[PDB]
């Protein structure tokens, strides 16, 4: 019966909420008392990557912490050299409408996707000199929100429909398809162990999946609007999100709760990007007020502000060594902060 | 200099990439982008068949002008998350099936989407090329089906010459910003090759206004 099934679902949801509440002794703010503050963070624009001619929608760092990839609304996808401002490649895209870009950990491939519902994967290192499309990944109905490389052979994708997918390069088919969401699924963030990954959707609910078994382990709620970005704690036992609710929240996998909320009354615009720093003490959040922010992780206090961009910050990421953070925005520039 | 040989060559290659990027941007600056929107029925495909996945593109040149048309009626997702990538489009093309009222009603859905596009915070300065197709079929079913079935406020005669003007003015009464942008209307049909010329004239007007704004004359 539909009525009986919905009543059971409601009472299991209540039971889960009760179990979560029963395992909350002291909040993160209370635990992080008598701990010294980070203080002001005076990051400076070390490099400005002024090559694009449209809105920077996505960025990703190489494992070397020196090679960048940027995707803009024009049919171009530039691969930069962070140290000396240069352009390693200018990859022409078959569809200028892009929403994501991913740099493979090995540096051999770069993936991109947008309103075409195609995760075009490119071959950076070939016997020729040009960069060519390795595979055109088809099978998503909605736009491609974000993609992340598990290795040179695998990639997960956050689509426009209520579906994520684990593709396998060398054969266009998708191995495991994750279907547990409602509404659009925005950016995802893989775990370091490459066995779980969190996903942000427009249902104000994030989910931790298991890429091997294909199921959803546990779900995280609390947000009041669509989650536009999500980043995963370096430890592997936490992650933080970002929503159009003008707030960010840090969740914990083994507690299943929200630990403490990154919301200031002075901010009304949403969050487009989120990236923990190394050791996970500073959380960078890219806001729509033509600006970024540096949010302390273990204390709600706000560190400095990265006011360098004329338009909305649509993308930002920390390097693997934590030495620099590069933030892209809807103005074609892409600054690197240190 | 204080650079090595490969460093200098890499800087030279980066400068070449800069030149190619600037050339491509100049090429794209000459291209007129036209977003395509429609009602529940896929009349955009039907009309574009006469002119001859998700987003689909239709490149064509008319009287020495490269055109871009972005039909995004197959996205089947939430329009909010991707309507913001379409600002800077020269003009937005919107089609309304004039015969699609005796079926919330479908013209009301069309008005809802028209309101959400015209009054969107991204398209304040973007003109809309409104198309009211199926004119013969509307003239055909206008007499049998009263307009009160979708226009309770309509009290005029059930004759085409006025029954189309009422719909045109009703659509024109949805843009709250009548100064930053303007709405162009054409009661098209299944047999009309002049729609390309209507779009061409509207695009010339829009680019004239954009040039005036750039040069400060407006």
């Amino acid at each position, epitope marked *: 019966e539909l009525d009986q099934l919905r009543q059971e679902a409601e009472q299991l949801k209540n039971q889960i909420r009760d179990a979560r509440k029963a395992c909350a002794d002291a909040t993160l703010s209370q635990i992080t008392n008598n701990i010294d503050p980070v203080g002001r963070i005076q990051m400076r624009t070390r490099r400005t990557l002024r090559g694009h001619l449209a809105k920077i929608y996505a960025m990703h760092w190489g494992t070397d912490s020196r090679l960048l990839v940027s995707a803009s609304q024009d049919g171009k996808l530039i691969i930069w050299d962070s140290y000396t401002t240069n352009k390693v490649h200018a990859i022409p895209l078959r569809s200028s409408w892009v929403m994501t870009c991913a740099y493979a950990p090995s540096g051999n491939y770069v993936a991109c996707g947008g309103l075409d519902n195609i995760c075009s994967i490119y071959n950076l290192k070939t016997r020729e000199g040009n960069v060519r499309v390795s595979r055109e990944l088809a099978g998503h109905t909605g736009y491609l929100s974000c993609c992340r490389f598990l290795d040179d052979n695998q990639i997960v994708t956050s689509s426009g429909d209520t579906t994520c997918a684990l593709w396998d390069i060398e054969t266009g088919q998708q191995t495991t398809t994750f279907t547990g969401h409602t509404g659009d699924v925005m950016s995802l963030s893989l775990a370091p162990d490459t066995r779980l990954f969190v996903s942000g959707a427009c249902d104000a609910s994030a989910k931790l999946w298991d890429v091997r078994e294909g199921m959803c382990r546990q779900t995280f709620t609390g947000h009041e609007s669509d989650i536009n970005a999500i980043c995963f704690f370096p430890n592997g036992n936490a992650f933080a999100t970002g929503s159009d609710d003008a707030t960010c929240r840090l969740f914990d996998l083994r507690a299943d709760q929200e630990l403490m909320t990154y919301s200031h009354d002075n901010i009304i615009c949403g969050i487009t990007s989120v990236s923990f720093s190394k050791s996970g003490r500073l959380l960078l959040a890219g806001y729509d007020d033509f600006n970024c922010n540096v949010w302390d992780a273990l204390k709600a206090d706000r560190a400095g502000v990265l006011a360098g961009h004329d338009n909305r910050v649509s993308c930002l990421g920390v390097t693997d060594d934590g030495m620099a953070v590069a933030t892209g925005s809807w103005d074609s520039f892409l600054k690197i902060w240190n | 200099c204080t650079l090595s040989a490969e460093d200098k060559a890499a800087v030279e*290659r980066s400068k070449m990439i800069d030149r190619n990027l600037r050339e491509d941007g100049e090429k794209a600056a000459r291209e007129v982008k036209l977003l395509l929107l429609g009602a529940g029925e896929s009349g955009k495909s039907t009309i574009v068949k006469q002119m001859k996945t998700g987003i689909v593109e239709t490149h064509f040149t008319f009287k020495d002008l490269h055109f871009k048309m972005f039909d995004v009626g197959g996205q089947r997702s939430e329009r909010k998350k991707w309507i913001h990538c379409f600002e800077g489009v020269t003009a937005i093309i919107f089609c309304v099936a004039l015969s699609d009222y005796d079926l919330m009603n479908r013209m009301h859905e069309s008005m809802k989407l028209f309101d959400s596009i015209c009054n969107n915070k991204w398209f304040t300065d973007t003109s809309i090329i409104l198309f009211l197709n199926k004119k013969d079929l509307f003239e055909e079913k206008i007499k049998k089906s009263p307009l009160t079935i979708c226009y309770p406020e309509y009290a005029g005669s059930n004759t085409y010459e006025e029954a189309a003007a009422y719909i045109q003015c009703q659509f024109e009464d949805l843009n709250k910003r009548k100064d930053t942008k303007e709405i162009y209307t054409h009661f098209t049909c299944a047999t009309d090759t002049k729609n390309v010329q209507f779009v061409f004239d509207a695009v010339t007007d829009v680019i004239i206004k954009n040039n005036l704004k750039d040069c400060g004359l407006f």
Partner: single-chain antibody
Amino acid sequence: VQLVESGGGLVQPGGSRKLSCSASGFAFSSFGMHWVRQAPEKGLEWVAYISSGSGTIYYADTVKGRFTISRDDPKNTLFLQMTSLRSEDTAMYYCVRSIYYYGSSPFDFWGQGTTLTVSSSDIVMTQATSSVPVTPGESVSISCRSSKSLLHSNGNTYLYWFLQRPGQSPQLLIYRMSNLASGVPDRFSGSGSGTAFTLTISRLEAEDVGVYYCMQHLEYPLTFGAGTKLEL
């Protein structure tokens, strides 16, 4: 990805000719091309260069003014017009493609080369003893010094390593200090310090036999070295 050289013959002293190589199978418009020449029984010697877009042309001291190099993107062919040929320009000229970006492998593919017959401030790189007796299955450490420190301020030593199998074209082996080219096995592994350089072969078979060369790319004349010939 064959890059075939056409041209050459019995040119009279004081004559002139043009050497053309036709690239077939890669982005010629993006690859920057090098010309190198090899005496009939001696080592290699850099000649000319054309960068991508033909915007940077650099010449060797011996061929400066005498030789005019040209690039033709649409036909995917690279030229070399030679004027006032002397008695020492006889060689088996080689065409070398080279792409320059971060993480690139310059001097990667080498053309088959063409023969030429003429009738009747620099970084000195040296290879020790020019000859090494080896046997299959052993390990050999080929070393070559320099005249100036190759370690630039950006941290990468600008050394290379090439292999010339008998009757073949040179390959790319180690495209910087402690690097490895594409297609070469894991056996080759060379690492040095500053001016001194070494290359080590773990277990050499009959395939990795011939004369080896190391060149500098720090100061642009790209001086090569002698050959360390390996044989039983």
